[PDB]
């Protein structure tokens, strides 16, 4: 447990770590992978190139520092991390590994300025956080293992169906190879797919929102095929699209995540999604429409009808349920897309154009999409007078990028 | 923080670690020193061929496991370890190093039996303990640094005086090379000498009780020359006797230890020492005899007059102070030692032979000597009806050997 002086050295040196974040990260991964190459099967090797983990580092240290005196704030962010670590299968025996190489990297990068006081302060911070996280993770693993259909580690699933939703999104319906039950989850949570990537010669692991309601038998994910454009195609999404077919197997983690509706709440929900960001929203939509009403406004932004996932099922739902309001925004509508017919508004989701429809008293707001889209929606909701406690979000990259 | 299920795996598998302690200890040091040979400057390299560490490991894992549900019992022993680690200069950044190699060793020795559940439980135990220890050690370093004449790390001292006390015990009076004040200590506390051992080509560190009262200028240690007999001579004790002379320099730690008198207490103290175990007792004697009386019974066992340290000063004190009773037992008296004249009783310290003299109401008892001697005295004091809360001891090896 940290003394005041130790917290103060952390506060004082957080900017020093942040502005050297690039070199510390590079040195950290080089050291750590030289000593433990097997860990490349757990880390993302695509992010291993790009900015950008350096952005997240800077944000972590700065958020750690500004919150080191506020254990409640600290516990909440740690929960997001523990959930993500549990999904990846992070093990207690890995904390000393990561800790040594992280400290060796800080030491190397800071050179002469890596004084005993600084290294010692951060080494203590590291051990404090590690203890909190290992215990959270352990609790998460045990709760999953003990529930009906629950497990620890990887469980083999088989693809039962694979249904294209648009030119870029495809849904995979997944049942366990063993034919047994599958643990429940809160709508909004995710699984992780761990699969071998022959281009890399390594396993990679990626999270996917559980895009259907819980049913005890199967899970559904909806995977957007990534990239080409100007930048490299993504490893796992293309691999799932092109090489994982009906009857093939993948390994899945038990559901985790702290982004989810409270299923027991009477109160309204507003679901604001950009592109593939709709995936947790659909799960939330389908559970909420179990009356208990509850009142759902589904707000979705997509480029056009060619990329809009689950177009038909969503409008059919809005014709059938009183408590659902559907608003679709097309940013670049196709010649055959017509406003007021195939979608409601042109351009990006704009909350002012549906203000009365979304300002439901007692409402919780959920937001998922690219980070610029998320910050835009976040700011707009604040401008209406909605309290931050009522705004929730899940990132399709690192959860610390728009904090 | 540990879940019930994690503590349960610890409780169930302690015996497995204890049974394999020998191999785990051998593998742990091999791995650790291969990766960080510099740590050989901090560990004792007379573990050359020593099971002393396997004994202590087996006791630690069993004591830890049996107490894991009682945090108060756990905190108290962790204080003894924190004080010893602080004396050694153990650094927060070394916790991930020890943790990794310890876990790697547990994994290699247990082989097939190192299941995920077991490795995970002990890894969490390791991190939980590491956090508590680092925080205690940091608090200890800061308190020392902030006090008049205190410091962190090594401070250079010069031997001002070197006085033989018997054929085997020599005192060293030490003042700081910088000429500044030295920090106060509680009587019974120790320093650590760190010194280069050329036979080893390494620094070695040994604790020595501070054998005089605090005075703001100097420290005194009294060092028994170890070995020859049948076993190898001790490195540091022979080195100090033969090559550290007046004017030479050694490095010392600030005082630590949880074995000491309460200087502010009115109540009586009984001081039971075997051989070199008298050294903290003398400090405690000299402070207590500052009236505030307090009432001191100094009970000492030594083989004979040739080996009895500080013989003349102790009897002279007993002639001068009303509130001091002196009892000397010689186990193997020399022809020229006469009972009733040069010592009070033949044989080992036996408390029944001075029962009325030691059964002072409200008394605290302090015991220091070889472990068999300490258990003997401990048991005897219990048989008189003294509460365990009133019996204190400090070990000249590992503090967990007679718990
Ligand atoms: C909680 C959570 C839930 C998620 N839910 C979903 C979901 O429901 N549906 C879904 O499709 N995704 C979801 N994701 C995203 C998903 O996990 C993967 O990130 C996504 O499928 C891309 O994985 P990949 O292996 O295909 O791409 P990677 O190979 O890992 O590449 C990552 C991205 O970086 C780009 N890139 C790669 N290399 C470079 C480079 N050198 N320079 C610049 N750019 C580069 C790629 O084009 C790609 O867009 C979720 C993520 C999280 C954290
Ligand atoms: C809290 C504390 C306070 C202490 N206070 C004092 C004090 O006031 N005065 C004092 O003199 N000592 C004190 N000690 C003991 C002291 O710390 C040293 O342990 C002592 O001087 C021996 O160190 P050494 O380097 O000479 O022996 P080491 O070289 O460390 O060897 C340790 C012992 O093992 C034996 N040994 C070495 N090799 C072998 C072998 N391979 N096989 C079998 N046996 C072997 C040696 O003969 C020696 O006695 C204290 C210890 C503690 C923990
Ligand atoms: C106290 C120590 C640790 C801290 C503070 C920490 C913190 C973080 C943070 C802030 C994130 C980003 C969270 C997100 O995705 O939303 C993260 C992700 C991640 N962590 Fe840790 N962590 C620690 C230890 C570990 C350990 C021991 C491992 C085991 C290998 C680990 C492996 C990972 C991986 C694989 C990711 C996802 C990043 C990626 O996609 O490559 N972390 N952790
Ligand atoms: C959770 C982690 C740790 C635990 C539970 C632990 C526990 C202990 C215990 C029980 C002892 C015996 C104390 C004695 O001498 O009587 C000890 C001693 C010691 N520890 Fe640790 N310790 C830990 C970490 C560390 C670290 C990180 C270092 C850094 C080098 C370290 C270095 C030492 C040294 C040098 C000794 C003295 C033993 C010797 O003389 O060789 N320990 N520790
Ligand atoms: C928007 C987008 O497309 N985005 C996708 C996700 N992309 C990303 C991937 C991983 C990531 O990770 C977070 C940071 C980065 O570095 C570590 C790695 N780490 C360490 C322990 N557990 C994880 C770290 C953590 C704490 C400490 Cl103190 C030190 C370190 Cl070096 O976390 C950060 C970002 C970045 C790009
Ligand atoms: C006189 C002599 O010749 N002798 C005197 C006694 N001297 C001694 C040295 C070490 C010792 O050890 C106690 C325990 C047992 O072994 C470790 C080593 N260790 C680890 C961290 N700090 C020390 C240990 C501790 C905690 C954990 Cl979780 C794991 C491990 Cl393996 O200490 C006990 C005694 C060795 C030399």
Swiss-Prot record, chains A, B:
A cellular-component GO term for this protein: cytoplasm
Site (Influences the redox potential of the prosthetic heme and FAD groups): 84, 394
UniProt-listed InterPro entries: Cbr1-like_FAD-bd_dom, FAD-bd_FR_type, FNR_nucleotide-bd, Globin, Globin-like_sf, Globin/Proto, Hmp, OxRdtase_FAD/NAD-bd
Keywords attached to this entry: Cytoplasm, Detoxification, FAD, Flavoprotein, Heme, Iron, Metal-binding, NAD, NADP, Oxidoreductase, Oxygen transport, Plasmid, Transport
Binding site for NADP(+): 275-280
Domain FAD-binding FR-type span(s) in chain numbering: 152-262
Region (Reductase): 149-403
Record field: catalytic activity: 2 nitric oxide + NADPH + 2 O2 = 2 nitrate + NADP(+) + H(+); 2 nitric oxide + NADH + 2 O2 = 2 nitrate + NAD(+) + H(+)
Cofactor note: Binds 1 FAD per subunit.
GO biological process entries: cellular response to nitrosative stress; nitric oxide catabolic process; response to toxic substance
Effect in UniProt of substituting residue 98 to F: Blocks phospholipid-binding
Regulation: induction: Under oxygen-limited conditions.
Active-site residue list: 95, 137
Location(s) in or outside the cell: Cytoplasm
Site note Involved in heme-bound ligand stabilization and O-O bond activation, residues: 29
One protein family per Pfam: FAD_binding_6
Main location: cytoplasm
Limits of the Globin domain: 1-138
Cofactor: FAD; heme b
The protein's assembly and partners: Monomer.
Purpose: Is involved in NO detoxification in an aerobic process, termed nitric oxide dioxygenase (NOD) reaction that utilizes O(2) and NAD(P)H to convert NO to nitrate, which protects the bacterium from various noxious nitrogen compounds. Therefore, plays a central role in the inducible response to nitrosative stress. In the presence of oxygen and NADH, FHP has NADH oxidase activity, which leads to the generation of superoxide and H(2)O(2), both in vitro and in vivo, and it has been suggested that FHP might act as an amplifier of superoxide stress. Under anaerobic conditions, FHP also exhibits nitric oxide reductase and FAD reductase activities. However, all these reactions are much lower than NOD activity.
Comment on protein domains: Consists of two distinct domains; an N-terminal heme-containing oxygen-binding domain and a C-terminal reductase domain with binding sites for FAD and NAD(P)H.
HAMAP family recorded: Hmp
Note: No protein-heme interactions have been detected at the distal side of the heme molecule. FHP is able to bind phospholipids with high affinity.
Family that this chain belongs to: Belongs to the globin family. Two-domain flavohemoproteins subfamily. In the C-terminal section; belongs to the flavoprotein pyridine nucleotide cytochrome reductase family.
Protein name: Flavohemoprotein
Species: Cupriavidus necator (strain ATCC 17699 / DSM 428 / KCTC 22496 / NCIMB 10442 / H16 / Stanier 337)
Species lineage: Bacteria, Pseudomonadati, Pseudomonadota, Betaproteobacteria, Burkholderiales
């Amino acid at each position: 447990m940290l003394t005041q002086k130790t917290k103060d050295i952390v506060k004082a040196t957080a900017p020093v770590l942040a502005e050297h974040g690039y070199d510390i990260i590079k040195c950290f991964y080089q050291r750590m992978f030289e000593a433990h190459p097997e860990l490349k099967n757990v880390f993302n090797m695509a992010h291993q190139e790009q900015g950008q983990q350096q952005q997240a580092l800077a944000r972590a240290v700065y958020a750690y520092a500004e919150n080191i005196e506020d254990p409640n704030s600290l516990m909440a962010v740690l929960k997001n991390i523990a959930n993500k670590h549990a999904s990846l299968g992070v093990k207690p025996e890995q904390y000393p590994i990561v800790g040594e190489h992280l400290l060796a990297a800080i030491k190397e990068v800071l050179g002469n300025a890596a004084t005993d006081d600084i290294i010692s302060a951060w080494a203590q911070a590291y051990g404090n956080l590690a203890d909190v996280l290992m215990g959270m993770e352990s609790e998460l693993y045990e709760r999953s293992a003990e529930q009906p259909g629950g497990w620890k580690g990887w469980r083999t699933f088989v693809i039962r169906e694979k249904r294209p939703e648009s030119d870029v999104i495809t849904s995979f319906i997944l049942e366990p190879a063993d034919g047994g039950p599958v643990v429940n989850f809160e709508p909004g949570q995710y699984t992780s797919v761990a699969i071998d990537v022959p281009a890399l010669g390594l396993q990679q692991i990626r999270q996917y929102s559980l895009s259907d309601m819980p049913n005890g038998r199967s899970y559904r994910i909806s995977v957007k095929r990534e990239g080409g454009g100007p930048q490299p195609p993504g490893y796992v999404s293309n691999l799932l699209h092109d090489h994982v077919n009906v009857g093939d197997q993948v390994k899945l983690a038990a559901p985790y995540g702290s982004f989810h509706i409270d299923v027991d709440a009477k109160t309204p929900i507003v679901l604001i999604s950009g592109g593939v960001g709709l995936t947790p929203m659909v799960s939330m939509l389908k559970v909420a429409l179990q009356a208990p009403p509850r009142q759902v406004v589904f707000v979705h932004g997509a480029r056009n009808s060619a990329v809009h996932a689950m177009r038909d099922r969503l409008r059919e739902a809005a014709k059938t349920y009183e408590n659902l309001d559907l608003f679709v925004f097309y940013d670049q509508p196709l010649p055959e897309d017509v406003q007021g017919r195939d979608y409601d508004y042109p351009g990006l989701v704009d909350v002012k154009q549906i203000e009365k429809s979304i300002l439901l008293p007692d409402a919780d707001y959920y937001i998922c999409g690219p980070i610029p889209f998320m910050r835009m929606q976040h700011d707009a909701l604040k401008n209406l007078g909605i309290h931050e406690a009522r705004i929730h979000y899940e990132v399709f990259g690192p959860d610390l990028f728009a904090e």
